[PDB]
């Protein structure tokens, strides 16, 4: 389950 | 082929933390350009298509952690390399894999 604060994971943040 | 610099790599992944499954899915990425969370592409380096393995990334180094993930915890990934291929001109130009 994906959530807003970890939406990119496992892609790099930003 | 082997995962290496400038290959487009497709993986299937499961994210667990302390034995609890948190996520599952599939992605494609251009290798060698810091496109994944720190540690994951390093665990993928040199692997052949079809290899399945585990990788461990400290949760701190990813921006996700107001959550069910404890601070100082480890992200345990079970990863399977589905496909490795040469990048297209588009992909090399932008530094990212494309559909
Ligand atoms: Cl990418």
Residue numbers in the entry:
A (entry chain C): 1 to 14
B (entry chain A): 1 to 65, 69 to 102
Which passages does the manuscript contain on this structure?
Peptidyl-prolyl isomerases (PPIases) catalyze intrinsically slow and often rate-limiting isomerization of prolyl-peptide bonds in unfolded or partially folded proteins, thereby speeding up the folding process and preventing misfolding. An example of such a protein is SlyD (Sensitive to Lysis D), which consists of an FKBP type PPIase domain and a chaperone domain, called IF (insert-in-flap) domain, that has been shown to exhibit chaperone activity. Each of these domains contains one binding site for unfolded proteins or peptides.
We measured the rate of prolyl isomerization in the presence of wild-type SlyD (SlyDWT) and a construct lacking the IF chaperone domain (SlyDΔIF). The crystal structure of SlyDΔIF complexed with the M8A substrate offers hints to an additional feature of the chaperone domain that could contribute to increased activity. We could model 14 residues of the substrate peptide that displays an opposite directionality compared with SlyDWT. However, this peptide binding mode is not possible in case of the peptide M8A in SlyDWT because the bulky side chain of the tryptophan in position 4 of the peptide would sterically clash with the β8-β9 hairpin of the chaperone domain. First, the chaperone domain can contribute to the directionality of the substrate binding in the PPIase domain, as is apparent from our crystal structures of a peptide substrate bound in a reverse direction in the absence of chaperon domain.
